[PDB]
A paper describes a structure:
The trimeric spike protein is a major membrane surface glycoprotein of [name]-[name]-2 that mediates the binding to the host receptor [name] and subsequent viral entry into cells. The matured spike protein contains two subunits: an [name]-binding S1 subunit and a membrane-fusion S2 subunit. Extensive structures of the spike trimer reveal the open and closed conformations for the three RBDs within the spike trimer, where the open “up” RBD conformation is prerequisite for [name] binding. Upon [name] binding, the spike trimer undergoes conformational changes to expose the FP motif of the S2 subunit to initiate membrane fusion that allows the release of the viral genome into host cells.
Numbering used by the authors:
A (entry chain A): 298 to 620, 640 to 676, 690 to 736
B (entry chain C): 27 to 70, 80 to 142, 157 to 176, 187 to 210, 215 to 297
C (entry chain C): 737 to 828, 854 to 1078
D (entry chain A): 981 to 1127
E (entry chain B): 737 to 785
Amino acid sequence: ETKCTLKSFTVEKGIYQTSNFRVQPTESIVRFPNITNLCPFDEVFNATRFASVYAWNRKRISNCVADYSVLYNFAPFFAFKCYGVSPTKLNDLCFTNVYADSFVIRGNEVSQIAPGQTGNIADYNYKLPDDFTGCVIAWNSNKLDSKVGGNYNYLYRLFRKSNLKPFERDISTEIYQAGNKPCNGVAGFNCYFPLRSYGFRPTYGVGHQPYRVVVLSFELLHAPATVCGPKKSTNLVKNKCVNFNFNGLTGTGVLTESNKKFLPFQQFGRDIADTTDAVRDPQTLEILDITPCSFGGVSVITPGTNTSNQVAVLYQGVNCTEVSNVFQTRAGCLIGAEYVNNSYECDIPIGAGICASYQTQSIIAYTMSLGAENSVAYSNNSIAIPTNFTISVTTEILPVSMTKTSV
Amino acid sequence: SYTNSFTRGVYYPDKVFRSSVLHSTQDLFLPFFSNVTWFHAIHVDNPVLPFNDGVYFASTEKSNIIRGWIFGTTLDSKTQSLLIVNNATNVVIKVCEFQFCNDPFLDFRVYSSANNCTFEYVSQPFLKNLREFVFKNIDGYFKIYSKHTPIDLPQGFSALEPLVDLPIGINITRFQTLLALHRSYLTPGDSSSGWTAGAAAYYVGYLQPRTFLLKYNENGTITDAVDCALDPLS
Amino acid sequence: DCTMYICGDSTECSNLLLQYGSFCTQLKRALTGIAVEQDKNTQEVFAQVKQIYKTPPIKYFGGFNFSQILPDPSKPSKRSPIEDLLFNKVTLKFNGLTVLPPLLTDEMIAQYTSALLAGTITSGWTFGAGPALQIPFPMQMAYRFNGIGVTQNVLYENQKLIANQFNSAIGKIQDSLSSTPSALGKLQDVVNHNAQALNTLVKQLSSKFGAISSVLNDILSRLDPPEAEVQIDRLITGRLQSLQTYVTQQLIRAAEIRASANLAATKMSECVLGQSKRVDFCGKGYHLMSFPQSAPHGVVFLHVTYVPAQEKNFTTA
Amino acid sequence: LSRLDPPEAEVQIDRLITGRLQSLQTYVTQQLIRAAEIRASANLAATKMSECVLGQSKRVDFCGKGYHLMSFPQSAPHGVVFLHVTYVPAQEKNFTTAPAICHDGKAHFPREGVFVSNGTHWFVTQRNFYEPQIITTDNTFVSGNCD
Amino acid sequence: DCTMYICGDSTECSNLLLQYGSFCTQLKRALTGIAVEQDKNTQEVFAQV
Ligand SMILES: *[C@@H]1O[C@H](CO)[C@@H](O)[C@H](O)[C@H]1NC(C)=O
Ligand SMILES: *[C@@H]1O[C@H](CO)[C@@H](O)[C@H](O)[C@H]1NC(C)=O
Ligand SMILES: *[C@@H]1O[C@H](CO)[C@@H](O)[C@H](O)[C@H]1NC(C)=O
Ligand SMILES: *[C@@H]1O[C@H](CO)[C@@H](O)[C@H](O)[C@H]1NC(C)=O
Ligand SMILES: *[C@@H]1O[C@H](CO)[C@@H](O)[C@H](O)[C@H]1NC(C)=O
Ligand SMILES: *[C@@H]1O[C@H](CO)[C@@H](O)[C@H](O)[C@H]1NC(C)=O
Ligand SMILES: *[C@@H]1O[C@H](CO)[C@@H](O)[C@H](O)[C@H]1NC(C)=O
Ligand SMILES: *[C@@H]1O[C@H](CO)[C@@H](O)[C@H](O)[C@H]1NC(C)=O
Ligand SMILES: *[C@@H]1O[C@H](CO)[C@@H](O)[C@H](O)[C@H]1NC(C)=O
Ligand SMILES: *[C@@H]1O[C@H](CO)[C@@H](O)[C@H](O)[C@H]1NC(C)=O
Ligand SMILES: *[C@@H]1O[C@H](CO)[C@@H](O)[C@H](O)[C@H]1NC(C)=O
């Protein structure tokens, strides 16, 4: 690695920085807030009495967590056709409003509840938009909406001047002016009642029995979304740096408890450097400080391929209690060298007064010596007078000019 | 009347925590040492109070003489007007499409004739008795700050804690106070119902976009704030 | 860290960073050269002596008092009261920014300072030009007085007065240093500049630099692979332009520190290790001697100056 | 300029020019810093040449460690090597020293050197070479009594 | 002046410059330090007496 960093083959004697030691996270948490306003889906699907096809009952679903996975308590659906969306991706996309339109219809008329299709129901009673992005569910309701004599309470419109528009309702009961003869509120020739009734009976087959059909249409106006589906996992891992996603604050670090008492309205904390330092647990009220785990730099203290190949590693600025003689210094900690207790001349500097060299054998680590020891006898009646001279030569090399270059 | 709000009108700018540091933010704050309107002698006219940048509602009401507030567009027919009515143990926050009178009083339950409300938002009941409130509208969120501190406005320092947020976007340009007393006057037109009660004063002070430098202590409570376009030292 | 400062825990950002060029191996090559240079400036002034000298046990140099400059054996850290006062006045791994500790700690610099003090007190100036020669301190003071032109008789006769004046000056220098809190301004300015440049880099990371957000985990989760790239490219450009100027300012400050350290080493060699004939190079006035004192990021020279006073009018020919 | 068409190659050419200019600006800045360093080093070298080769200096470690005598310059492809001749004392010896000498009621101080003693004897010598000489009037001067 | 030199008269342009952060502060902090240093060099040579 030192040769790769230096881009050479014969590295000299010294300490060289090659890479950085990074602890990878093991697991990953996603602590988003506890679940609440399950939208009123059960009261629309498990209602007590459904409305007519022309008077299709509408509820607006807004400001509520939409668990679309409580659909699968109601039995095999003759149709769960989700148009424009997938039956699996619906519990993910947030939406502004979810309009639920329920109505009872025959078994042969359940197919008419879809975009584009025409017939006798979705022309004058309940027409769906062409570009309708939602989900139509339909299931039989014979056991509940069938009377022996006949349940003539469910009505449906058969005649109308012109077809309806997307999501339009008509509750008028005026006689159908079929011919030119202007009707006078009486029924008869060319003047028929528009609303007829269903003869729901238990003896009917499977195509004419009562079928309850609901339609959930999702709206995504520019308005902010208020109905968002559910989300959660559960680990408050400590003493280990993991990936946290606490109510949108995402990061990597050790989540350990603390005594940083926050105010009630606020969710996360920040130091001076604008970096995050603590965060609320969206479930139990307790403040945990975010602190990075072991992180620093590796340095190879190599004596050079000229002498040998035994090298030593130095992790700088990090305690190596976490991830070959281990010894902790004040500038880091070095593995591969032994701490010798005789101070010699510094050869390869490390930091905080520790140096390495080759004893000859293995890399050593010793406190650098500032020099020898000599204490002169200071006396008020003693002096040291020289006798001999020495003519020595001292070399002092100094650069003068540089390489004149142009671009 | 006209008085000065020396060192009041500060709140928490964002839901972030700090520990003994300084944070400078360009927000919509009340300018220090401004000229606010002390409406203490107006015992039910002039309800024309704008809502351009918000309102700083300060009061020293004795006990439950206020009944709530109303924030609307123009107080006309089919106009979104939010009414926050504070009862003894619950508050009601509904927006109505109704034409409100000059001074809708509460002692009554139905304010106008043709009321038509459409929202549903219930929360914890809100109502030396200083009750500081700061109202604003940004990002489609009708945002309020409330504080209950013992005392006019003193020279102390007290931040305004964000309590309740509610999503709505409208052209809020209305503001009026709803009082409470003994003599029942069902007449909406007659704006004269003065009763012998405690001292009533609804402070009105408009906010301004300014840069504020707040000091967060070790516990995360704003104890000092400086403005940056008044005094040269600031 | 060129990889972690620009690209936070993102492998695609790391793959995109290698296409910019060899800036990652040059910005870290210049900063380590700065560090190795800083590891040398602290050896040309304090490590001028070869053998460490010590103070004799008898604390009688002839009448003078050096208790405030000699190390105190009571305090576990072997330093002088002046060094202890100077150390208590200098007020001193975030996103890939580490602070490397110096080689010579505050204990080895103190030992070098004590050795230099012992050499300049007991031996005089011979400890910096060859073998150390013992000599009484009054005779060394007579030497230094004769070196500037003043005869040795004024010192050999009025020795008690000179000793009392030196003791009073040594005692008053502590109050003088404690009076003005901005006396150690040159040592605090460099520390403040360093902590400000180290803190201004984290403050600029929150800037979007043109992108929609500032964190990589948001751009790599809202936007799709090939429309996040021009954003990642702009973010890398902005984070590299903020680091290039930082490295340039660090190089300029390192050159300034190197020039200051060369000047300090020259002053230590020409004022502490001997007497100089320069006017205001070893103090304002007539220089006699100089005592060094260590400090967390510098050196304080105490220059002893002989100043004439109480002049009188006379006739000359 | 051969794969892409004129106006979609421009933002690419613009980005390439920006990248190649940002890599040259920092190079020029580093060159200026290194040139300032070289200029300071050359000024120091010229000062040393003028104060050590072209004469003798009284500075301690400006013309070599010790007592400077002379300096010889030598050229080098990108610098100058100064060979400083240093006189270093050695083979020192212990002796007895005294400030002055009281004789005839007068305190006499040495002119140059110090009063050395080696046992029941006193001589005068310089402070750099042991040369015992008898205490005479030529190398001594009276400056009062020995009180 | 970063605000007049880069963004002249243009409030919209200044609001983009603020998103670059502390660059403008570290520029004027150094340029005024240069002036303070130049106001000191004229006092170490001429103001010795
Ligand atoms: C979340 O639900 C768990 C289980 O009921 C409960 O113990 C915890 O207190 C809840 N947290 C909140 C937000 O109250
Ligand atoms: C390797 O050792 C040889 C022989 O002692 C010496 O000539 C040479 O300079 C050394 N090279 C390195 C890179 O240390
Ligand atoms: C490393 O951790 C151990 C155990 O907490 C501690 O005793 C030691 O002082 C630490 N070393 C340093 C200086 O980081
Ligand atoms: C070196 O000294 C340390 C600290 O006193 C001691 O713990 C250790 O045993 C010594 N090792 C050797 C090899 O003497
Ligand atoms: C040296 O000093 C000591 C302590 O004052 C004294 O007793 C001794 O006589 C002195 N010797 C001389 C005169 O050199
Ligand atoms: C407030 O403004 C009124 C006019 O609007 C003025 O008369 C009054 O003096 C001002 N009060 C202060 C001191 O701000
Ligand atoms: C309103 O206040 C009255 C009087 O205290 C109380 O009886 C009633 O229950 C309250 N209603 C609400 C909405 O809390
Ligand atoms: C030397 O200074 C110390 C500390 O101020 C003082 O305690 C002591 O009396 C002084 N001694 C002499 C001889 O002046
Ligand atoms: C010397 O005489 C001059 C002229 O009378 C006078 O100004 C000056 O102060 C005197 N100085 C001294 C030292 O007496
Ligand atoms: C002088 O005497 C002292 C004390 O015995 C001794 O330590 C020193 O080495 C001697 N020096 C010489 C030059 O003989
Ligand atoms: C000291 O040296 C001198 C000169 O050689 C000599 O005359 C004297 O006798 C010596 N003293 C002793 C006692 O050796």
